[PDB]
Amino acid sequence: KFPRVKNWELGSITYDTLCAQSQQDGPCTPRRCLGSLVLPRKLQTRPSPGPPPAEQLLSQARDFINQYYSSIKRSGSQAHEERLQEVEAEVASTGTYHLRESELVFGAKQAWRNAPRCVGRIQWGKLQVFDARDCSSAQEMFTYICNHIKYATNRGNLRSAITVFPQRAPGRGDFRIWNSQLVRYAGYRQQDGSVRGDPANVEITELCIQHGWTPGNGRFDVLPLLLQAPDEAPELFVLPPELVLEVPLEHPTLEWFAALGLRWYALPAVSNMLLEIGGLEFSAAPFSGWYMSTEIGTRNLCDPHRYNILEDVAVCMDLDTRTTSSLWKDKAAVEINLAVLHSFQLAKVTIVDHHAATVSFMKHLDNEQKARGGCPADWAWIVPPISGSLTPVFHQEMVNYILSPAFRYQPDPW
Amino acid sequence: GPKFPRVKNWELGSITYDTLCAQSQQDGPCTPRRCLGSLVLPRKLQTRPSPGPPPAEQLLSQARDFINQYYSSIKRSGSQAHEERLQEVEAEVASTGTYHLRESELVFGAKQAWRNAPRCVGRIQWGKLQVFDARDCSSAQEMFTYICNHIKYATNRGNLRSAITVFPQRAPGRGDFRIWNSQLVRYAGYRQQDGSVRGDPANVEITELCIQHGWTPGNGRFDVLPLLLQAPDEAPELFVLPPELVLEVPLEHPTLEWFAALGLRWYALPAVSNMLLEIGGLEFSAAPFSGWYMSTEIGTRNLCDPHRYNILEDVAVCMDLDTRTTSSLWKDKAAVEINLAVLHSFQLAKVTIVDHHAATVSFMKHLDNEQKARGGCPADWAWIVPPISGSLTPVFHQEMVNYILSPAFRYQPDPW
Ligand code: HEM
Ligand code: HEM
Ligand SMILES: N=C(NCCC[C@H](N)C(=O)O)N[N+](=O)[O-]
Ligand SMILES: N=C(NCCC[C@H](N)C(=O)O)N[N+](=O)[O-]
Ligand SMILES: [Zn+2]
């Protein structure tokens, strides 16, 4: 029933009762655990050519509406009762319904709060929500996106934000941002399969070129955006350079580091995930906050399938790359992460290190235990890619489950 | 696609399907509603003491499954010998309520148990285990002799060899053979007046139990604990391991000359001794096993965990780092040097050890071998990925499926 949750560093115990509120199934079963899998095999967000089962939708809507009125301490009030009737009325006559801006703001904050893989949830209550449901063209999407970036960047003093475009509708195409993030570096396939730039963005870089983009030939060329309005081909838009803040990477004491010519953008803005609230689905809702240093210094720059700069830094450090036992990889990774933190701090751009971030998450777990009786969390994504057990979250048991409102993965539009 | 879990490796972009999980005969802690994969001790396998003899119907099915596994491994499934063995087991259980394994069945079962352990990253060595049969043991004193022989053979003066010693299985309404200590070699943990602990905080309870049973405690930070061995229906007996048999390694650093002055050290032989080995329904409550250490076990967990020796701050201070702010990455830097020291020192003393890079690379080979041999490999991601430099190793980028296969090693309640 209710799982016992233990923290092995402190010996403390809690019981997660919130998990009983989950209504959506994960990938695990008593026979085998699939918790380490990145994407679902079925829990996707299948096509929307037909109207979602009124019965199903209506139960999800009532539940969300109930959540909303409880949040404003007006449960069972007159407004609550009437809002429910409104929702009932709209679904029965049209097969769908619409949220009020206040409910949308509450829903977006709750989705972030419920995101099991996010370690920055202590900030969940501070989110600027831009209502972009009044959008009817790719060109208008571009304007909203540019305004999101300017606001979020704030000259280095990053502010969390999300822009919500029109919801999905039966039998009609979705509004979609093809890019995986608003700002990404190009990846050009060259010679013998090798790649100049970010290997993770090969497919999108090619699609952009296919749609008329004049490619560059550098390692850090910011990609243009491919925005798509319902049932229309995606359109190409180049982001004004002055809008895209970047940070030149240098090291506090290693004079030669800057000579590597490395850099990274200041704004992390996932733009290909789906936001679900009360049964309604928002296929284009880019969100952003600020980077945790390991995302850049460890994963983006050191992953074998990414920039893979470990060996270069090791050679410049004149380390012994002859054997694993010298821990040259470990030493290089630490300096690279140090350079990232040093550079962002020098450029006066917001960023948080993995120690500070995990400490804040533990506080978040405590806050949620008192407030809701639990907190859905995915251990493999919460524990940092380097120095895992050196952080507090490593020693904390976690229960993972799906709560709604939620952010979910969805098929690539092409 | 295939009606089995699809598993992806994000570094290579390759895919595999796990069909071996279909063989699982025991449920884990997860459900479609929520994942409990991160729990260290979810009340599942937990071999809680089940005194009164087990349901002849349950044991029989488990026994039949194991016998089928054994005959399959030697390619004689369905043979006359196979059907005769099945008859023998069913008859023995019918008259006595339990049954016994043949020598070769025990050897096969013990290796399979290791092969099946989801939390072990050193499984590429599973086929080379030395299995010591101690099922004739009849006293606590004899358990000590068997244990000392295990330590001598396994240690082999620095060139470690994997081994396991199996004592008598649990019997109908009779006391179990039990080793009270968590490992054959462990450092004492002494509770101080101010509330702190000198030594290893993880062993405070066992240390106090040893004292309660007549052990005269020391006062060091690295005192090797004595063994509390228990024979059927008897109070446990205390035995001190001869120092010459317990090989230890003083820690020093390759370039930081002052590290040696810290007086740190660790023992060479990791030997978990409180787990239960289950084979075909039969339960071996005392069956210690050992191989060799992966460097992060010592350098990262044992030495740097907050609830263990917790030496991070001391080393950072020696390196003159800024321990006042997280962004200086003082914890990360100290940890790296501590791990290098462990590797350097074991190499210097010629004691077998494997770094986390070499170990994870070998585990990837094991996964590839097992994909072909059994169609999958149960693995606990959180335990397989190392505690430092996680994504710098290949296993981090490999998805994994976790499930319970038998034979298996399971946790069991403390005897006290
Ligand atoms: C304020 C600073 C924030 C920090 C430091 C932060 C940090 C992180 C980290 C480290 C991850 C995992 C990244 C990876 O391994 O790819 C993550 C994932 C995630 N975060 Fe946060 N986050 C923040 C703000 C936000 C905001 C504003 C939202 C949404 C409104 C959000 C939603 C999520 C979601 C949905 C994921 C999972 C993405 C995926 O599945 O790939 N985060 N976050
Ligand atoms: C040959 C070298 C070996 C290496 C390098 C190795 C390494 C490891 C590591 C790193 C762990 C996790 C440690 C922890 O986080 O507490 C582990 C766990 C485990 N290993 Fe291996 N192992 C080896 C040999 C063995 C042998 C010989 C057996 C048994 C025949 C074995 C059975 C297990 C089991 C059952 C666990 C889980 C224990 C628990 O749940 O606490 N290992 N091993
Ligand atoms: N910090 C955030 N990260 C989302 C994923 C970014 C990705 N790891 C990368 O580009 O490295 N989100 N946020 O703050 O909104
Ligand atoms: N390597 C092994 N590890 C098992 C657990 C040992 C524990 N982490 C510690 O003492 O640090 N076993 N083995 O080799 O048999
Ligand atoms: Zn699970």
mmCIF file of C-alpha atoms and ligand atoms in Angstrom, chain B residues 114 117 119-122 125 129 162-163 275 289-294 297 301 354 383 409 411, ligand 2:
data_model
loop_
_atom_site.group_PDB
_atom_site.id
_atom_site.type_symbol
_atom_site.label_atom_id
_atom_site.label_comp_id
_atom_site.label_asym_id
_atom_site.label_seq_id
_atom_site.Cartn_x
_atom_site.Cartn_y
_atom_site.Cartn_z
ATOM 1 C CA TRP B 114 26.243 -14.605 -8.507
ATOM 2 C CA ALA B 117 22.794 -10.710 -8.728
ATOM 3 C CA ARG B 119 23.523 -5.190 -8.014
ATOM 4 C CA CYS B 120 26.927 -6.704 -8.940
ATOM 5 C CA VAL B 121 29.174 -4.973 -11.524
ATOM 6 C CA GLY B 122 31.885 -7.649 -11.432
ATOM 7 C CA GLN B 125 33.996 -13.175 -13.581
ATOM 8 C CA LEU B 129 34.115 -18.896 -8.683
ATOM 9 C CA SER B 162 36.827 -15.338 -6.001
ATOM 10 C CA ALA B 163 35.362 -17.913 -3.612
ATOM 11 C CA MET B 275 23.312 -12.907 2.992
ATOM 12 C CA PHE B 289 31.500 -15.004 -0.544
ATOM 13 C CA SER B 290 34.354 -12.793 -1.805
ATOM 14 C CA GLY B 291 36.101 -11.524 -4.947
ATOM 15 C CA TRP B 292 38.045 -8.239 -5.045
ATOM 16 C CA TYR B 293 37.290 -4.532 -4.617
ATOM 17 C CA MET B 294 36.295 -1.974 -7.210
ATOM 18 C CA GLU B 297 33.707 1.086 -2.918
ATOM 19 C CA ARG B 301 31.626 5.163 -0.299
ATOM 20 C CA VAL B 354 39.843 -2.667 -10.346
ATOM 21 C CA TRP B 383 24.046 0.131 -8.045
ATOM 22 C CA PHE B 409 21.442 -14.133 -2.812
ATOM 23 C CA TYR B 411 18.892 -10.289 2.517
HETATM 24 C C1 HEM C 2 35.312 -10.461 -8.697
HETATM 25 C C2 HEM C 2 35.116 -9.193 -8.230
HETATM 26 C C3 HEM C 2 33.918 -8.568 -7.860
HETATM 27 C C4 HEM C 2 33.692 -7.237 -7.950
HETATM 28 C C5 HEM C 2 34.686 -6.206 -8.497
HETATM 29 C C6 HEM C 2 32.358 -6.961 -7.455
HETATM 30 C C7 HEM C 2 31.859 -5.680 -7.261
HETATM 31 C C8 HEM C 2 30.632 -5.397 -6.668
HETATM 32 C C9 HEM C 2 30.171 -4.062 -6.333
HETATM 33 C C10 HEM C 2 30.879 -2.735 -6.676
HETATM 34 C C11 HEM C 2 28.987 -4.218 -5.680
HETATM 35 C C12 HEM C 2 28.115 -3.122 -5.027
HETATM 36 C C13 HEM C 2 28.744 -2.738 -3.699
HETATM 37 C C14 HEM C 2 27.896 -1.768 -2.883
HETATM 38 O O1 HEM C 2 27.435 -0.749 -3.449
HETATM 39 O O2 HEM C 2 27.707 -2.026 -1.670
HETATM 40 C C15 HEM C 2 28.705 -5.647 -5.624
HETATM 41 C C16 HEM C 2 27.550 -6.203 -5.016
HETATM 42 C C17 HEM C 2 27.263 -7.575 -4.937
HETATM 43 N N1 HEM C 2 28.111 -8.588 -5.404
HETATM 44 FE FE1 HEM C 2 29.796 -8.355 -6.527
HETATM 45 N N2 HEM C 2 31.707 -8.146 -7.100
HETATM 46 C C18 HEM C 2 32.690 -9.133 -7.284
HETATM 47 C C19 HEM C 2 32.577 -10.463 -6.850
HETATM 48 C C20 HEM C 2 31.425 -10.986 -6.242
HETATM 49 C C21 HEM C 2 31.306 -12.374 -5.866
HETATM 50 C C22 HEM C 2 32.457 -13.386 -5.918
HETATM 51 C C23 HEM C 2 30.000 -12.582 -5.493
HETATM 52 C C24 HEM C 2 29.362 -13.784 -5.136
HETATM 53 C C25 HEM C 2 29.684 -15.051 -5.536
HETATM 54 C C26 HEM C 2 29.347 -11.287 -5.580
HETATM 55 C C27 HEM C 2 28.010 -11.043 -5.204
HETATM 56 C C28 HEM C 2 27.449 -9.765 -5.067
HETATM 57 C C29 HEM C 2 26.152 -9.467 -4.457
HETATM 58 C C30 HEM C 2 25.069 -10.463 -4.051
HETATM 59 C C31 HEM C 2 26.046 -8.116 -4.346
HETATM 60 C C32 HEM C 2 24.943 -7.300 -3.642
HETATM 61 C C33 HEM C 2 25.183 -7.102 -2.144
HETATM 62 C C34 HEM C 2 24.187 -6.145 -1.500
HETATM 63 O O3 HEM C 2 23.011 -6.124 -1.925
HETATM 64 O O4 HEM C 2 24.576 -5.423 -0.556
HETATM 65 N N3 HEM C 2 30.231 -10.263 -6.060
HETATM 66 N N4 HEM C 2 29.715 -6.396 -6.243
#
